[PDB]
Write a protein that binds this ligand. Structure first.
Ligand SMILES: Nc1nc2c(ncn2[C@@H]2O[C@H](COP(=O)(O)OP(=O)(O)OP(=O)(O)O)[C@@H](O)[C@H]2O)c(=O)[nH]1
Ligand SMILES: Nc1ncnc2c1ncn2[C@@H]1O[C@H](COP(=O)(O)OP(=O)(O)NP(=O)(O)O)[C@@H](O)[C@H]1O
Ligand SMILES: Nc1nc2c(ncn2[C@@H]2O[C@H](COP(=O)(O)OP(=O)(O)O)[C@@H](O)[C@H]2O)c(=O)[nH]1
Ligand SMILES: [Mg+2]
Ligand SMILES: [Mg+2]
Ligand SMILES: [Mg+2]
Lengths: 486, 436, 425
């Protein structure tokens, strides 16, 4: 379960003079009441901070407890959420006088690393970005709009984001400071401090045992979200309006992610991460393999009744987001013959071979001249290679044979020549695909017939249990399905 | 006497306005050019119809009306039409583009461009008034302008004219005529945003009017023109007292007094009779008794609900035409013996009565037969909660999925405004539950 | 909300684009010289949506013609209505794209894009109230898909308040130039998902299937496919080009049709299907039939989020209303219940040439996942083996960009699946 905390900021001078009763009432350190006797709603949280709360105290009951596990290779996230003016920028990046949770987090992390130098070697890689108007901008080095890309292996990565390697507490705190100044913050007369963008500081820890008698890696994300803005309550226009819209949409996106994640009864069901760049960055940080803490900031005043209620409903719902945690852990003439075979240079092939080039050379992936020639439709080089001792059934590190490749790309003549030279019609690659599967998927009907004529097994199934027939059915490919019908 | 200003917002508001003002002119003997032969005092006057019409030195009678739409197409028809010379041109305000069925576009993005201009034009009208009572506001729930812009207007009027009354004629959506899937959203948002700024709101269910037109008027496929004519007859009955110096509902404040004991529960159900085809004009004229009883037949209601299984908070009966007071008292005394009626604890069992002696008027195109006597019942019943429920339900279906919500948020709304709006509606349904 | 700027890019784009202008010009009674010679004022009431007025009675399409190869715009110029286009609005390069998305998006296409944007911006300046843009293109080639999607993002950046609509032709092996078409299509879908408000999915798979199985043409040409495209595009745009109050502008259509940001891919449908008079019951019936869809998906396999139906010709609006209520009643399961009243119908008095009555269907169906699944698997088959990667990486592209496009299109499919199953409330 994700950890959720509430920070009730002290009433400002604007709220004091009004003299409207306080809606937020702190009973226990766990319990808060929303609209006391009126709704009178009891909320249970992991921690609750009153108006007299210091930065140290918030830090003491948020990040500080998790910094041990971070060092032991556990992903961490702190995200400040809540309405405008509730005090999330105060909490996260602090004032000139009073340092925020980010500062304190980083200060204590480096102290910890210094105390355990003799037992463990630590290195940190850091980045600081801004989500502004559905665009990501690096806050450390002024890089342009950056693209967000996703693999099922590395997760979501920000392409072009500069990684820095601070070695002391004073170095990392300098980057923090550099970014805080680069962050888009517009000084308005109405609102002195209002965030226009979402600040995301990331820390990548690599940790090894000092004697190495297995490296532990972890990502810590510190997020200061901008708050939503009613275009009526504020009255924004121009660039400030667009800012408000983009922010509100990101928060809509975040809202949907929280709801879909929480008490979902549907872990098999889709989560709309891609609805916002913000929710894409936070994908690995919301209820996955991550210790996440929400600092939900609220005003105590009646003036922000609805705003406060909205925050609390979402904070409360975030508690139901479940997380499963885990500590992270030949020849020179060969190269030339490969390239030559790929490029379909018949003459260069002959010459390279005449000089004794290994016809069965492999690249880093285990591809041979025959594979490459078969792929890129160079019939003449295919014949030449086969005539001089090429392994017609060679496999790369992925199990692809020449025939797999000729079938995929749809080179009919090559497919025939391969078979006539004893290609395995039913070779299986690492994906469980045969030549038939590939020719089927790519809608090469003449190749399918030829493969079948040469004894292709119509009953062979891929990793997902699909035969060529199954594929044709699941595709509404009647032309294909018709031929496979027996 | 004391003047009332009419404001018409969006297509529905405007097109209803056309039908109302046409009917008003017909009722007071005013011509399309604003010339009223029967008015002998050319300069001005303290007359009853002057609540709704101002007077120019050329003997021209001018609606105390503002027409507002965010796109020009509809108001352009007014500007080019039979009744173009009726209005001062400044009273017909248009923008460049509409709100695209989006409350937020009407309330914020597009609406904020024109709001100040509109208030200036309204102010021009208020300055020609010796004692302004307040405003009658006509709009759809379902339109982007009807919902979003009305809300905005009502907010600004609460500030600029704090002590003035504000009454709505609101068009509740029906699938039969609707052209936007998001009409449930627009309706709820505008109900919540408007609630604290409105004294009394007369809802007209498009489905109800459609039904009446089909059933009673034998109209195969009702157009807006057909709907509007019927609506205008109901508006006319409601505003008659304001325009003909009656004894019941003599001013705007009295509507609240007579219909709204509890501020938030300010939605009277209108029932109207008789609605008869001209193809049946030759029939025997219906009596006071017959039309009074037709006020309790559900098929004659302006909003679909069941008052028989609900409780009344107030009930006015507004008679028009050849109506003898004693016959009214007879009919009303008789209603008790039909045992249909049940009132809330803290409220009196009285049916207030208004009689005006002006026979109903039908317009040139009308399908409605001219009758000697007609009645409109205004009853504040808890049954109308059923209308909110149906509407709240459709909201819930979509909002659960956040369907279409990005369109509103993309216009500078927070998701939270949907929650706030829906919760106020849940409270309103509870309000109706409690008084039961 | 008045003017729409039309853009056609690449071979396919310019082919179907031209045909569209041929067809709609006839409907609006405009000759190849740009002179009006029609019957009813109904043809001129909203001409400004597609055409500018020039000196004289001259109507000129608000159309911009783009290609990285010259050949196509020479054939466009020397076509039936070639003379009608503004000569300044032809933006052609010399090199070509060689069916390579990368060349379209990053190299050759990227160095012609500013020239196009100039013409767009010029056309834009002379608009009273710009609705937005419509782009016709193929997803399978280089120019249409690579440059087209680069164009789309540039226009989204420059005009963020305007509606972006595309007519996007999806590739098929049955009508294939190459086997890199899946790569090209998937890279574009990734672009379309982010940067478009409404995409009409025209599927060569479906167009072929229709020509081969229904029309019984042994070997269909591009002219045959394009005949179905022109009809569909005509029908889809009727509400924009003729008087009416439903889906009458681009924004109102979007608000009615698109419940969720990413789910903005529509299955076009048409009835009757003819090759070079139906009762309204029949017309309505055929619309919702799998055989008449322009995307190769079975509607019966999914659920409709929203539908817009458009009937053309002299017929009773009452009869239409009964017949559309019929379909929703008889087949209740095919329409999501959590969007009340999600089928909207419009009638237009003027039919298309050669038909007395016709119907066009625009469905936001979850069955479109079948289209995306078909492309996805072809993409994966190819990408697993890394075939032709050098074509793309050689133009400065990262391999990760392929992974990103794959991930996204699969997520789209999954997002569609959620709403096909999201009965529970
Ligand atoms: N009774 C009646 N209802 C109407 C009329 N015109 C529109 N409506 C209804 O009003 C709703 C549509 O709102 P409109 O008034 O057309 O919209 P609008 O206020 O112009 O707002 P936008 O066009 O979105 O800026 C639907 O429920 C229609 O059925 C009319 O003349 N009479
Ligand atoms: N815990 C606190 N103690 C004292 N003052 C506080 C506290 N939290 C906030 N404030 C004051 O409130 C002001 C605004 O808070 P701030 O943290 O900038 O809001 P925010 O939540 O970041 N707003 P926004 O970025 O627009 O969403 C600051 O300038 C502080 O003076
Ligand atoms: N329906 C249709 N598809 C076409 C046409 N011309 C090309 N295509 C398809 O478009 C794809 C190739 O893209 P194309 O537009 O030719 O290349 P580009 O000029 O680089 O954009 C393939 O899927 C072709 O089947 C045409 O006239 N009609
Ligand atoms: Mg802030
Ligand atoms: Mg309108
Ligand atoms: Mg007078």
């Amino acid at each position: 379960h994700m950890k959720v905390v509430v920070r009730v900021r002290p009433e400002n001078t604007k709220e004091k003079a009004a003299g409207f009763h306080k809606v937020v009432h702190v009973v226990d350190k766990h319990i808060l009441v929303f609209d006391p006797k009126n709704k009178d709603l009891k909320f249970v949280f992991d921690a609750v901070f009153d108006e007299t709360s210091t930065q140290s105290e918030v830090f003491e009951h948020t990040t500080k407890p998790i910094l041990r596990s971070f060092l032991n290779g556990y992903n961490c996230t702190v995200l400040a959420y809540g309405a405008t003016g509730a005090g999330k920028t105060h909490t996260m990046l602090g004032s000139a006088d009073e340092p925020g949770v980010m500062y304190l987090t980083m200060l204590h992390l480096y102290k910890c690393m210094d105390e355990i130098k003799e037992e463990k070697i630590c290195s940190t890689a850091v980045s600081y970005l801004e989500v502004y108007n559905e665009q990501i901008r690096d806050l450390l080095v002024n890089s342009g709009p950056l693209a967000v890309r996703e693999d099922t292996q590395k997760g979501v990565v920000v392409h072009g984001l500069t990684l820095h390697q601070p070695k002391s507490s004073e170095e990392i705190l300098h980057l923090l400071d550099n970014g805080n100044k680069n962050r888009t913050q517009h000084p308005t007369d109405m609102n002195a401090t209002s965030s226009r963008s979402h600040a995301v500081f990331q820390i990548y820890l690599r940790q090894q045992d000092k004697t190495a008698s297995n490296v532990r890696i972890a990502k810590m994300s510190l997020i200061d979200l901008a708050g939503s803005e009613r275009a009526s309550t504020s009255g924004a226009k121009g660039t400030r309006f667009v800012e408000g819209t983009n922010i509100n949409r990101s928060l809509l996106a975040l809202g949907n992610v929280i709801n879909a994640l929480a008490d979902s009864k549907r872990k098999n069901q889709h989560i709309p991460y891609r609805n916002s760049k913000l929710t894409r960055l936070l994908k690995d940080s919301l209820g996955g393999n991550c210790q996440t803490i929400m600092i939900a900031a609220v005003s105590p005043s009646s003036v922000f009744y609805d705003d406060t209620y909205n925050t609390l409903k979402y904070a409360n719902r975030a508690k139901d987001i479940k997380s499963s945690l885990k500590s992270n852990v030949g020849s020179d003439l060969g190269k030339k013959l490969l390239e030559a075979a790929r490029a379909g240079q018949d003459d260069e092939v002959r010459i390279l071979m005449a000089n004794g080039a290994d016809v069965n050379a492999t690249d880093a992936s285990g591809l041979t001249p025959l594979h490459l020639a078969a792929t890129y439709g160079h019939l003449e080089i295919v014949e030449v290679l086969l005539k001089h001792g090429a392994d017609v059934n060679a496999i790369d590190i992925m199990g692809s044979t020449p025939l797999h490749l000729a079938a995929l790309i749809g080179h009919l003549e090559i497919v025939e020549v391969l078979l006539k030279h004893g290609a395995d019609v039913n070779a299986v690659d690492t994906w469980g695909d045969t030549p038939l599967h590939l020719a089927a998927i790519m809608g090469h009907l003449e190749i399918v017939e030829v493969l079948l004529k040469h004894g292709a097994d119509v009953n062979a199934q891929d990793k997902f249990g699909k035969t060529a027939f199954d594929i044709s059915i699941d595709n509404g490919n009647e032309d294909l399905a018709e031929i496979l019908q027996k | 006497m004391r003047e009332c200003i009419s404001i018409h917002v969006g297509q529905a508001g405007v097109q209803i306005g056309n039908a109302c003002w046409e009917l008003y002119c017909l009722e007071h003997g005013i011509q399309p050019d604003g010339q009223m032969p029967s008015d002998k005092t050319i300069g001005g006057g303290d007359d009853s119809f002057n609540t709704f019409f101002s007077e120019t030195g050329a003997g021209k009678h001018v609606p105390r009306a503002v027409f507002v739409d965010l796109e020009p197409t509809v108001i352009d028809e007014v500007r080019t039409g039979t009744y173009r010379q009726l209005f001062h041109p400044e009273q017909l305000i248009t923008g460049k583009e509409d709100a695209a069925n989006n409350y937020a576009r009407g309330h914020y993005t597009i609406g904020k461009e024109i709001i100040d201009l509109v208030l200036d034009r309204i102010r021009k009208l208020a300055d020609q008034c010796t004692g302004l009572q307040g405003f009658l506001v006509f709009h759809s729930f379902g339109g982007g302008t009807g919902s979003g812009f009305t809300s905005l207007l009502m907010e600004r009027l609460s500030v600029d004219y704090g002590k003035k009354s504000k009454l709505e004629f609101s068009i509740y959506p029906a699938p039969q005529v609707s052209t936007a899937v998001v009409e449930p959203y627009n309706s709820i948002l505008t109900t919540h945003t408007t609630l604290e700024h409105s004294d009394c709101a007369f809802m007209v269910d498009n489905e109800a009017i459609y039904d009446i037109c089909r059933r009673n008027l034998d109209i195969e496929r009702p157009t807006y023109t057909n709907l509007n004519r019927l609506i205008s007859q109901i508006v006319s009955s409601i505003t008659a007292s304001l325009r003909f110096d009656g004894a019941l509902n003599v001013d705007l404040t009295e509507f609240q007094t007579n219909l709204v004991p509890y501020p938030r529960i300010h939605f009277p159900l209108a029932t109207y009779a008789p609605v008869i085809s001209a193809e049946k004009a030759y029939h025997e004229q219906l009596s006071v008794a017959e039309i009074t009883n037709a006020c309790f037949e559900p098929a004659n209601q302006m909003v679909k609900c069941d008052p028989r299984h609900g409780k009344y908070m107030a009930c006015c009966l507004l008679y028009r035409g050849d109506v003898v007071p004693k016959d009214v008292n007879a009919a009303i005394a008789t209603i008790k013996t039909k045992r249909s009626i049940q009132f809330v604890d803290w409220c009196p069992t009285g049916f207030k009565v208004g009689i005006n002696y002006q026979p109903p008027t039908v317009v040139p195109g009308g399908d409605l037969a001219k009758v000697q006597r007609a009645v409109c019942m205004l009853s504040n019943t808890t049954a109308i909660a059923e209308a909110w429920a149906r509407l709240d339900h459709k909201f819930d279906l979509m909002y659960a999925k956040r369907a279409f919500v990005h369109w509103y948020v993309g216009e500078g709304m927070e998701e939270g405004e949907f929650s706030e709006a829906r919760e106020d509606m849940a409270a309103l349904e509870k309000d109706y539950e409690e008084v039961g | 909300m008045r003017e729409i700027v039309h853009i056609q890019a690449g071979q396919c784009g310019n082919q179907i684009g031209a045909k569209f202008w041929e067809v709609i010009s006839d409907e609006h009674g405009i000759d190849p010289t740009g002179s009006y010679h029609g019957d009813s004022d109904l043809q001129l009431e909203r001409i400004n949506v597609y055409y500018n007025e020039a000196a004289g009675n001259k109507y000129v399409p608000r159309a911009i013609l783009v290609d990285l190869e010259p050949g196509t715009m020479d054939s466009v110029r020397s076509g039936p209505f070639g003379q009608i286009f503004r000569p300044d609005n032809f933006v052609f390069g010399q090199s070509g794209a060689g069916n390579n998305w990368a060349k379209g998006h990053y190299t050759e296409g990227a160095e012609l894009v500013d020239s196009v944007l100039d013409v767009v911006r010029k056309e834009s300046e002379s608009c009273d109230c710009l609705q937005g843009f419509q782009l016709t293109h193929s997803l399978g080639g280089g120019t249409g898909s690579g440059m087209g999607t680069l164009l789309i993002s540039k226009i989204r950046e420059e005009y963020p308040d305007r509606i972006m609509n595309t007519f996007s032709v999806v590739p098929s092996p049955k009508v294939s130039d190459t086997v890199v078409e899946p790569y090209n299509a998937t890279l574009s879908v990734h672009q379309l998902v982010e940067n478009t408000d409404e995409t009409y999915c025209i599927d060569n798979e479906a167009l072929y299937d229709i020509c081969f199985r229904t029309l019984k043409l042994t070997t269909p040409t591009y002219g045959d496919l394009n005949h179905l495209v022109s009809a569909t595009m005509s029908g889809v745009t009727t509400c924009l080009r003729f008087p009416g109050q439903l889906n009458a502008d681009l924004r109102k259509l979007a608000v009615n049709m698109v419940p969720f940001p990413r789910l903005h891919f529509f299955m076009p449908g048409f009835a009757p299907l003819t090759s070079r008079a139906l009762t309204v019951p029949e017309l309505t019936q055929q619309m919702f039939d799998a055989k008449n869809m322009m995307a190769a998906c079975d509607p019966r396999h999914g659920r409709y989020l929203t539908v817009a139906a458009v009937f053309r010709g002299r017929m009773s609006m009452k009869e239409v209303d009964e017949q559309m209520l019929n379909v929703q009643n008889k087949n209740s399961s095919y329409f999501v219940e959590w969007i009340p009243n999600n089928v909207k119908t419009a009638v237009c008095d003027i039919p298309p040439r050669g038909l007395k009555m016709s119907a066009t269907f625009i469905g936001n169906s979850t069955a479109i996942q079948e289209l995306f699944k078909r492309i996805s698997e072809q993409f994966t088959a190819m990408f697993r083996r890394k075939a032709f990667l050098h074509w793309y990486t050689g133009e400065g592209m990262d391999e990760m960009e392929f992974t990103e496009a794959e991930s996204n299109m699969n997520d789209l499919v999954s997002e569609y699946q959620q709403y096909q199953d999201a009965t529970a409330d």
